[PDB]
Design a protein around this ligand. Sequence first.
Ligand SMILES: [Zn+2]
Lengths: 106, 381, 242, 119
Amino acid sequence: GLVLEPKVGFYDKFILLLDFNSLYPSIIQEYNICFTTVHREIPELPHSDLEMGILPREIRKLVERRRHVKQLMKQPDLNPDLYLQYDIRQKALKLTANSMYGCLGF
Amino acid sequence: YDPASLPDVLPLYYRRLFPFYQYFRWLNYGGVVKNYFQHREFSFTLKDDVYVRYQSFNNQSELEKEMQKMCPYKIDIGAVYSHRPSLHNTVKSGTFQAQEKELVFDIDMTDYDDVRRCCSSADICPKCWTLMTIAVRILDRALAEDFGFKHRLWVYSGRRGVHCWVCDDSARKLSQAERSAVAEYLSVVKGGEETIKKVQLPETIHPFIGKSLKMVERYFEKYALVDQDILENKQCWDKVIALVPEVARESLLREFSKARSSVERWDKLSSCLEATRRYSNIPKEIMLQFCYPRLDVNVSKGLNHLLKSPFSVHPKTGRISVPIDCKKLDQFDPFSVPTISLICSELDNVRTRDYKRTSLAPYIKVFEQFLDKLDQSRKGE
Amino acid sequence: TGDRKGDLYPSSLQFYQHPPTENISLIEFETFAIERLKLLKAVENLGVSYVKNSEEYSKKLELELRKLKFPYRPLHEEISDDVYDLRRKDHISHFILRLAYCQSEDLRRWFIQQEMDLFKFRFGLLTKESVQEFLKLNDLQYVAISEDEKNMHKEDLMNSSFGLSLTKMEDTEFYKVPFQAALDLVRPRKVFLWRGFAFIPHKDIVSIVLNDFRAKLSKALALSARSLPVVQSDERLQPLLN
Amino acid sequence: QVFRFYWLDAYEDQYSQPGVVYLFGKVWIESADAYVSCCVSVKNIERTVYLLPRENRVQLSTGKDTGAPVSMMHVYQEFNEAVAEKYKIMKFKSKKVDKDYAFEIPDVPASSEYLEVRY
Ligand SMILES: [Zn+2]
């Protein structure tokens, strides 16, 4: 994994932290990387003509489920118990989506 | 011809008339390339408009069998793929690619509707067929001179127009981009129904355009000035006036009020334009807009395009898609083309020579000569 | 050919197809890298400031090439040792910069652009003989038409090339190329086709050559980006290339 | 009788008891009005194996293709005769299945028909 080495120093201005944990699932979705779409040196990207693979489909399903759960949570005047349930479900979905890459990488 | 009689005649034809031997000679291309015939895509249209594709066959026997079994209403030939189409489900995604196909052109009378006066839509008559007669000469000459394609089979489409199959090995390996380049090079009449002036030649006439205008001129007087009578009355010559600058339009109108024949009106228009010099090509632009072929670049650009097979039967006219001899083009008559009903009547009136007893024979002969030329090229090379 | 030379560098221009196999010094590595970076930056600045066909562009680019000692002019003498050295420079420096300019798409595009510009300039400085030599050494197999055939198709050639005068046309020689390579010219009907070959003047041919070059170069850059992990481990070359 | 229970854990001992898996969980008891722990043993889980047919019969001793197209009846016969008896397999059920494979083993088509043997 490429690392932009720290720029050691003191900063008196505001500093922004952006979470890129969704980087690898996002790459898998966008470029249609799958066991069924990539020929096996780094293999070339699958052509855009190919339909979505199984692994991208699973990652997309998880992301869309988290989006739906978050949208339901955004609804005002909701039961706190159901709010806790949806929060836990959203956390689980995020964890699974972020951990997906380990199946291919390790 | 009764189209309810189509389901009765189709089997017999596919059993005793469809030239399977020569058909396999064609699509097999002398066996030089292995799996060439085995990777060819076909598509069938059956009764009640049921469409099937990714059909491939092992050899002539399998094709004859499955065809006589299905009795399709339409047969379309497609590309030669990387694998056998029948097993496209088995090929890993992205690994199923169309690799080679003849370069094909479709010229359809319906695309000339805004510029013909005798017929409309799917109607054709002897007065308008000369347009096709022009196209075949204009295009085929280019294909024989500018591009050097040597094996070209022209086929009647059955009703509204003609197809051309350019089958040189070089023409079969052309990429999509090269095909699009070839189509655009041959294409002059650009625009839709919303544009009036569809040809705008530059000051310099490219040699190809000069030779196309030379071919057009030979026929123009008969087609446009005698038969079509594109200057018969005001409702029509208003268009041609609409195709030239307004400056002389008035000057023309009075002249067209004193002319009795459209040949006279053409002479007057040519004289007036000559008198008026950057517009010296305007008559050529009018001739092209009334005579030059229109080409659907989508038909010829894509490798995966399925086009009507030769010796097909037209679902409505019943005519056979017969090859057209280039030399005898001037004698070709789309109304004398054998229909399936006529050739079944002929068949039931008397093994590998049955077709020689029908009116289909000279067209199979032209096809056999074309295949003989292809074989000579495959050998000599 | 003094001590350790060969036929490895026939012509000045090259497509940079075969990577170098020599063992060079770190000092030579750094000098070549920086020198070609200067050359490419000069190319970019001159392209921004001037029109690439302008005479000022040519003069300034020749001055820069002379200052940095890169091959830019032919020599109908032989492969002199000095010339060999220069060509070797060019060949190694290019690949070094490839290693430098393959990490990011932006960088890749920049590199490609500069390289193409330089190549075009050098082609523009090639005499017809030299041009043919080049077109042969790389198996481009583009035929220069005879004078007799040119007279045979004089009128067709005159009407094919835009803005070509009779006498000026008599002063020009065309090339025969398969039409599959002149797609961009044939498609708008700006070059005559006869029997499957386009007759391209001395001005358009560079375009086709460049197209080929660009294709190759893009492919190469992709491969280099694919072979990056092997180089990052060499600390010596990391501060430079990164 | 239907036994409804909420399962939480499972345990398998491949070496000790073949084909048996234990499921642990909660079962409601009305006599106690409470959930109690329960263990359910699931036995007779058959080994399922998939044999990949060859394109042409190959002599293993020489490794040269014999050019004979291999139908699935040939694979069934080879399994019944050679493999089945050579590895002390007495009873098994064979079937024809269509399966896909897109993973890291060379020379396996993306989609193909396999002989599914359950024993
Ligand atoms: Zn008509």
